[PDB]
Each structure stands twice: as structure tokens, then as C-alpha cells.
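Record format v2
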Amino acid sequence: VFRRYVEVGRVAYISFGPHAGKLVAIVDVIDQNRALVDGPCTRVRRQAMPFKCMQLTDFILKFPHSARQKYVRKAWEKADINTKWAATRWAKKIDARERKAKMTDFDRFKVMKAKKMRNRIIKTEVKKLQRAAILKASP
Amino acid sequence: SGRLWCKAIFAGYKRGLRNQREHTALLKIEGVYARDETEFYLGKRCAYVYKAKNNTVTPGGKPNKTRVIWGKVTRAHGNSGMVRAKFRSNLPAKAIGHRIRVMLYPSRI
Amino acid sequence: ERLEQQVPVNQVFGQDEMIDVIGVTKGKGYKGVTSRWHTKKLPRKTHRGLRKVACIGAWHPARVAFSVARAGQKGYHHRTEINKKIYKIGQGYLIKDGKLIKNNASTDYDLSDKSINPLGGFVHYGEVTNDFIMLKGCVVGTKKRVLT
Amino acid sequence: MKTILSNQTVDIPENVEITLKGRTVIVKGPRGTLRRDFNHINVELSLLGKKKKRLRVDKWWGNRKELATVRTICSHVQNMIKGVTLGFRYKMRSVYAHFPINVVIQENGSLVEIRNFLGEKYIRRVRMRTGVACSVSQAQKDELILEGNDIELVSNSAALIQQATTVKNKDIRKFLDGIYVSEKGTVQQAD
Amino acid sequence: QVLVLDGRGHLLGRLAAIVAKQVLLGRKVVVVRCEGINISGNFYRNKLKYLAFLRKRMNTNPSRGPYHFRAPSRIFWRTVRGMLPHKTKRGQAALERLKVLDGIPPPYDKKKRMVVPAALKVVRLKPTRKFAYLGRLAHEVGWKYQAVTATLEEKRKEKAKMHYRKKKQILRLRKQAEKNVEKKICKFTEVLKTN
RNA sequence: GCUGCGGGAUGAACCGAACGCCGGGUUAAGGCGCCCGAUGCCGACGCUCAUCAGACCCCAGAAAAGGUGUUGGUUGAUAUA
RNA sequence: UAGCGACGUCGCUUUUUGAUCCUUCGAUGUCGGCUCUUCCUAUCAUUGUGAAGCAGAAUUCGCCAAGCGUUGGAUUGUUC
RNA sequence: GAAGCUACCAUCUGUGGGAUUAUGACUGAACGCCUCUAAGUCAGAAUCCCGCCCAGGCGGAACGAUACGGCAGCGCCGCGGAGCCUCGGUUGGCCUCGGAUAGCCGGUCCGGGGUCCGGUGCGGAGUGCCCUUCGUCCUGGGAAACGGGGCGCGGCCGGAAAGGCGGCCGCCCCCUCGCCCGUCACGCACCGCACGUUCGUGGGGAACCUGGCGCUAAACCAUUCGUAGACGACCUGCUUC
Ligand SMILES: [Mg+2]
Ligand SMILES: [Mg+2]
Ligand SMILES: [Mg+2]
Ligand SMILES: [Mg+2]
Ligand SMILES: [Mg+2]
Ligand SMILES: [Mg+2]
Ligand SMILES: [Mg+2]
Ligand SMILES: [Mg+2]
Ligand SMILES: [Mg+2]
Ligand SMILES: [Mg+2]
Ligand SMILES: [Mg+2]
Ligand SMILES: [Mg+2]
Ligand SMILES: [Mg+2]
Ligand SMILES: [Mg+2]
Ligand SMILES: [Mg+2]
Ligand SMILES: [Mg+2]
Ligand SMILES: [Mg+2]
Ligand SMILES: [Mg+2]
Ligand SMILES: [Mg+2]
Ligand SMILES: [Mg+2]
Ligand SMILES: [Mg+2]
Ligand SMILES: [Mg+2]
């Protein structure tokens, strides 16, 4: 229960807003409704963003409270968040959504044509596995 | 084969509270629920298709019971993706809650 | 198991059993307010008659209320009476050892030959040769009327 | 003022085992087991530590009225532990100034029959809540011992017994008669 | 062409407004399991409101007056009718599109139910707020079929449990088959265009 | 009165605004959960729980007094002696 | 301060009267009594309750409370 | 003074369950203690609702009979054919419960417990299957042993809250280009245009020619009765034993 917490050094994802789709680092909490975010390596300046605007992630970084950019970027590069961000099941789903939205007509046609070949073999194998299980449970 | 138009419902004419304007009609097109999404449908032709008892001549084929009222999208309406339209003749009041097919004949993108 | 078979009343009911009677009351026809709602009669000096309701309602209900006594049909209503005690379940004309044995209405203290039907037959009703039920007090409905 | 964090820690003895599938708390001890649903509190419960197993109760962003329940939860857990370890025993003595109150148990102390209360011929039958057993103690006159595990049930049965014998249409200051809970304690001592 | 909206968890007015707006467009809406519709506020408060509504009645002839309904489906129907222009022909024609029903009948147990998050109590009311269930509120005032409703709900739930077990077994077999046929099925297009 | 029109559900005096017949755009007052056009904004801050909540000049309801129900403020007095 | 509570002061009511004359003068039949329906509560009694200078009984002050009752006559046209 | 009407002027009967108000209480913090309350529990009444009773909706179910006679007439199955009225849709989604300070999936073990994945939900409705197919023919690679449509048969009713489509097995007239990629050659190539493509063997009503299987009534009026009636209405009878 409550395995995520906001703190000095929490990397969060911006769901909506002017910087939607980018990661930021929570430097400190201001007034229990918005927090200062840095995001040095994600191409965003230091500003205050509401808590409901951001989404928490799993990674945590070691910053002193109210630290400067030259001290937060060093720890960001030490933690190496950017390269490991692609090696997760969440950024992969996000990129998958982007690709499905970027689908063109030829891409949709090719996907529709590949579904015919993919789903039918799966169905004909499920029809065999079900009968195998029935024959196993028969005696 | 297959449908070549978008689906839209006729909710009512352009109106205030104690008066109506039958020259302009409002359309709720399916799939559009925001103001930033209705810019694609601006200028698209619209057709209210119904059936009568007396068959009339059609541009292609034998006469049919089908009768269509033509119009087109004029501008947007509100922030909920609703759109406006103006037809050659005003829509009958019985068409409220029915379907006007939005064609794609005027193409820009 | 009991389809297409007869059911006596002694199998369904017993003695000293409180019972409910459902029936239709005596039809009396179109009756006035004094006969249907028992409204007090107006004095003799009144014009337009006596056996009426002097006041229907006030000025501003704008209508006649449903609770005002009105002259209409009285009687022949579906009624139910509760807490009716059963006194006797009797039957007669059973066997032919005695050529015609009734033995009805003969208590263990009386021990005299008698029957249920009175001396001279029932009024507006024939014989009660079949088995009968003897209830306390009066019961709704006219003579020879079906009751449940 | 939307306090950030409010935490309360409760210690747990070695005899009793406590578990949580959520807000539900189940305590298993030497005498029976207790289980309570806290779905109407909206507060975090977490057990931590090996061979100690302390239970912490955490509330985040609670008002002045919501920060009060974090102590009531710990008090309820303490009462559950106390009842599953030692149990709750209420001694209720009956004041019978003139008419002697004749109390009897009907079925394993689950039903109390009271006769001759202020001379009335009415027979007052009060059933106990499940898990509470009542008896007539010895070496003392006109008393009833009510023993159980759940305090909210033992005290409820005691209050039912006390309210069953209530004067009506008379003076309350005068006519001091009825069964009143004199003593409240545990079944097991030395704890 | 129909919208089978579940009833449990949704607030009375918050759901009825959406249904009344969607019916005037032409979509045939069927609200299923109306006995679970929650109502904000204290249960005693809602009971007092309903009793004050019951007190209102024509004096001269109560039969020819306000018809108070006791079933929760009929309560929701009257709530939607209060927003629909039922005195006009448009509202009269739209009133048949709405089908409020208690429980989940045979014609609708097999259909998948929809949930409107704009009327859900979880997002509408704070977790500390009191709410009242329409089923209990109606049963406390002149409703008699709560027991049989609960019994039939238990029956259909015990049936849907076995149906879901069968569906889950089918899904497990499908995943096993997908893992089994690794060769002969490349489908790099499916991964490059992300399903 | 001599005066229509848009809002105040309703209306003589209120708020805008004054009037030939029309098409397009905008707006005043007012409003955007459904009746009924528009917030279906991933709106902001904070207050409020009533077993008689509250919801917009005229306008259609209320006082003195009180609350250890909460939420802010002021003057003060005590406490590692 | 159980029960009252002066000197002062703040409210509700149109079951009294009074102030104005807004609708009614080509008419709204203007006292009382009889019969009958419904509603209100500021409760006389009855159901369940709290407080007394409530020992019991009989009483007095309130609370949720209009479901059920609140009569028969002498004189008066009388309301009273 | 019969019968009938009638009298508190004679006689019989008039009934209980729930949530709760006022109030008294349990556990219990706020506020180290106390507190019926702040979250949660208990008892609770001429009041509220229902139970009993009264009438049953432009409310619906279960069952019986469904038109002889001499040509008729009307139902069920399988049907080919024409015309008329209506208004609406342009793929269908065949389903666990339940919470939101928690839950989903997978599972060795003893319905629950433990462990392992997923968790701004991907075994996800911002979802998934059928799918975006103009048709015919020759010929190659992958997949396919269920075959693939059913005017076809048998076994189960699978499911009663308002049920009828789907699955399995045995055959039937037969079938390995029905799917994906490649290949030679054709077809309304109508000459830039709208109401096109769909659940339509849509709903309803009157008849026409043809096959097979079955049916041979009941209401109202008249008459009679009075347990009922202002008139209607309502309760009843007819057989030649
Ligand atoms: Mg007669
Ligand atoms: Mg005279
Ligand atoms: Mg006394
Ligand atoms: Mg009723
Ligand atoms: Mg003048
Ligand atoms: Mg002028
Ligand atoms: Mg003017
Ligand atoms: Mg106006
Ligand atoms: Mg001004
Ligand atoms: Mg002005
Ligand atoms: Mg204009
Ligand atoms: Mg404005
Ligand atoms: Mg609107
Ligand atoms: Mg107030
Ligand atoms: Mg107003
Ligand atoms: Mg006024
Ligand atoms: Mg005057
Ligand atoms: Mg006159
Ligand atoms: Mg008059
Ligand atoms: Mg009364
Ligand atoms: Mg009488
Ligand atoms: Mg209380």
C-alpha cells in the first residue's frame, strides 16, 4: 500500500499540460498542491507544477532540497534515467500508442492483412488444445 | 462497398431560449467531442436522406422512394464538438434525433 | 395422487378452528346517503327534502372530495369476515343398514332423532343432505350463495 | 489544516497473531479469534518487524475530524488483543432493596430470565449476543458475571440487562432497584 | 444500437441527466440493475425527502393525482422523466427509448454492461460522505420484491462465475497456443505498428 | 401609460436595449448538469455536512441571544528553575 | 433560573379590532344555528419519554407527536 | 300475521412486521482524562411504510375451443410470383462479483493462506475478433487434417426473471485456389459528379396459381331465472329422458 511517494528527488511524468509527455524531477513541495520541478535533461525549465498534473514513477534520485541545476543534472546523469527509461514496459506502451496513432492507410491495411494470417492459426491450434484437454479429462 | 460518410445526429436548430432560427441547424457528429477536432469537418457536405411514398427520379438508376435534402457545414458550435450547418431548405422538425450523413466530397486534407 | 378425486370438508377443516369467510354481501341496489353512509337526517322543516347531505364541502377545494357521502349503489360487495369459530362438522345419509339414517343435530345430551334442516325445510333453500359446516354468528351473503 | 502525516504505533505480544487482508483485521490468540472490518475508516494499517510485529496506523491529509479515528482504530485493536488474550468479564450486581430479584440462566448463559423485579409478574427475557456467556457467581449475593471476548458485545449485553430492569411511571432517585454493572475487568489476571 | 448501462455505483441524478441527454439524440438506453443506484446524503435524509414527496397528494381525489412509485426502477424512470420534456411529442416519443429494469433479466444478462464514469460515486463523492442505496430506500417504502431480486441476482452471479471461469480457461489456452507457435508466425508488422 | 425585443421560471415600473423586410459576424444584461443554445475546460484557491443545508437588486421571508461543530484573527497569561 | 420572573428588549400570527381603498356598483345573496368533509398544532386526554420544592397517589414544566376523541342540557337570535 | 326489508331496539367480528423519532445506552478519540458521536453499534413508541382488507392499467401471463354442408372457410410446414402503406437504420462486441488507503493474472502446497509476473490497467473497450471483399481462370510457396456453407437426421434441453440461439458426436450431395505472398490472361474501361453499398426471405393489411399435414366452433340478440336489478349490467336452465 502506497509504494510511491513524492519527495526531494522523485522523477515524475507529465500527463497533460504544456509539457505533456516529459519527465521532471521534484525538487521540493511548495503548498501541498504544486511542487517545483527541474527536469534538466528532459528539455524543460524550472517551474511549479500541480500534483494532479504529474504522474509518479518508480525511480528516485538523490538530490539535496532546493538544489541547483548543476547539482541535479549531475545526479540525473549518475542515475542514468534516460537510457533505462526506454527499457521499461511503460514507455514501451506509450510509444506503442504513438505508433498506433501514427498509423497510415497502408499500415492499417498491412495490419488488417496480417491479422488474417495470425489469428486463424492461433484459433486452429486452440481448437486442438481444447480437444486435447477434453480427452485428458475424459477418463 | 462500405460506408463512405460520417454519422451525425440532428439535435435541433440554432435557438436561444424563447425563439428559434430554422435557417441554421446544429449537428452532433459521432466521434467529435472537442472544439479542436471539428476543424476537419468544416465545409463538408451533409445529406438528410428519407423515404416517401411517391418515387422520384435519381441521378443514377431508376426512380426510387428516396429523397435527400442537401446542405453543408458552416462553422463550429460550442466547445463540445457540436457543429453548425445550413441546408438549401430548412430541416423538418420531425428530423430531430435522426441521422444526417456527413459526406467527404469537399476534401482539403 | 388426488387428481380426479373428491375432497371432503372434514379432511381440510376440523372442529374448534378459527376460520375466515370470503363472500359477496346482500345486494340492496341504489340507496341514498342515509341508507348507505347512515348520515343523520335533516329536520322536517327543510326544503328540497330530508334524506340528503346538507353540505358537500367548503368553497375552496374547488371540487367535491372523495370522502363526502354520496348516494349510489349499496350492497353486493366483496367482503371478508375474520374470527369465525367452527362449531360442528356433520354428515348424514351414509349407509343402508338403517334405511335412511340422518342422526344430525343430535348431541350426546339430546340423543334424539333429528336432522339439520328445520321442521318444514329451510327458507328459500332445499335440503342439506350433504355434509355441512356450522359457524358461529351471522355470515355475509344471501341464502344459497357461494362462500369460501 | 490538512495535516501531512499522522501515525500511531501499537505493540503486539508473542501469544497473539494478527493478520490483515486490507482494512480487515483478524487477531488469533489463546482464547478464540476476533475479526473486524474497518472499511469505513479509510486509514492505512501496516504491520512491521519480526518477533515484534508492531502495527502502525497512518493517515495522510486528514482534517481535525478525520485525525481522530487513527487513535480509535488503535484503541479497538488494543481491545481486541485484550479480549483475545484475557477476555472481558463484567460483574453486575443487583440492588433489590425490598423485592429480591431472581435471575436464572436458561441455555448456557445465552438467555437471562428475571423474576420478581419490584414485585411485577412480568417475566423479562433477555438474550445475550453470540459469544457472551453469563453465570451466577458464587461467594457473593445477587450478582451476575458476564464473560466474553468482544468488548462491544459483552458491554452491549450488560447494557441490555441493565436497561431491561428500568423503573417506569415512578421516581428514578427513589426506588433504587435493578442490576447495575459494578465491576469491569479481565478473566485472566497477572496481565 | 443500444446502450446497456449498469446501475450499481452510479449516482441518481448524475446518471439520469446523462441518460436523459442521450435519449433525446436517439440512442436506445437500457439501465440495468437499478437497485444499486446510490444517492448522496444521509439515508435518513433521503428517507425524509421521499416521505415528504409521498405526503404530496391531491385532496379531493388521490387516485386522480400524483402517482408515487415504490420500485427503484420506476423511481429512476420518474427522475429521468422530470428532465425529459414529457409533455411534448418529442419527449413522449423519447420516453420509450429508455428501459429501466430491476435486476438483470435474460434479455440482458448475456450483454456486456457499460459504465459511465461521470456518474460514479467513487469520483463524485468524497470517501467520507454518506450515501444511501436506492434498493434499501425503496424496500423501506412499499417495495416487496427485494428478497426475490437478491435471490435471482445470486443465481445469475453464480452462473456468470462459471461462465467467466470457462472464458478464463479459453484465454489461458489461447496464450498457451500463442507461446507454442513461435515459428511460422513472425508478425513483425504487428509489433512494428503495435497491434 | 404612449413600447415592442433579450435575461429576472412567471410579471407595468428591474437589468440591457429601443422596433421597416432579410443574410453573415459580434455583443450588452444574463447563462453554460437535463428541460434549454452553450464549460464534455484532464480550470485554480479555500469554506461548508443540515433528522428544516444552500443556491443571485427590486423578488416573495426573519430578529435579539447561544454552540467544547469546524475554519481564520487579536490581546494576554504559564512551561525543562 | 423545580416553577415564575419586574425594570428593559427582540420576534411570529392574521382565530379580535383598527389603518389604507387595490379588484367587485349593467348585484360575488350580507348574522347565527343544523348537516357534512378536510387540514393545521401553539397537545386537553390517550402511546413512548426528560425535569421537580416528583416518598406513593394526585399534580406542574418540555420533548418526537394531529393517528384517534374532545359530549348531554337550562336562558339568550346570538359569536361570546 | 307468513315472506321480505329493518334496529346499539336483536346478533357476530374487528388482527402484526420493519426502518426509526423523542429518549435512555455500548465501544470510543478529538482533548494523556472524561464524553451516546467524530467514525461505528443497541433498545425504542397511538407517529411513517407495509402486512390484513377494498377497486383492479392504453399492464402482462397459463389453459380450452377455434367456424361443413353441398361448392366452402380457417390453421401448420415447405414454397416459388406480382403489387400497395409505414418509418428507421449502412458490420456485429455471446456477460464474473467487488473495492477505490486497492485489486488483476499465474498457481506448488495445506473455499482461504504463501510465492511469482503485470499495475496511470496491454490476458488492456484510447480494447479485441469478423473484418476495408469487384468478380472469373492457369500455375507456385506457408498454413490447414477441424474439412466448409446446410431446404438434412439422431442424442441434450444447455437456459424460466420477460427462454430459442449456440456447442459437442455419428453420417448425409460433395469439397483440399474458401486464408497470407507471388504469377500469365479477362470481364458495363459508361468517357469528372447526387438519392451507392446494409440486419430486408424490414413491420402491417386484401387477394392470385401450386405441394404435404390437420380443424369442423363460440359469442351477442330473443326466452327463462332473481342470489341482481332505475335502464344497461350481473347470478342461472332447455335432453326428449
Ligand atoms: Mg332487491
Ligand atoms: Mg320552507
Ligand atoms: Mg406519581
Ligand atoms: Mg398499497
Ligand atoms: Mg389613458
Ligand atoms: Mg414617449
Ligand atoms: Mg419601455
Ligand atoms: Mg422577457
Ligand atoms: Mg442603472
Ligand atoms: Mg436600462
Ligand atoms: Mg442577425
Ligand atoms: Mg455576461
Ligand atoms: Mg444543451
Ligand atoms: Mg436557518
Ligand atoms: Mg424570481
Ligand atoms: Mg407578492
Ligand atoms: Mg374595501
Ligand atoms: Mg348572481
Ligand atoms: Mg355565487
Ligand atoms: Mg385526524
Ligand atoms: Mg351497524
Ligand atoms: Mg442518539
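Helices of chain C lie at 9-12, 33-36.
Chain C touches chain E through six residues (CB under 8 Å).
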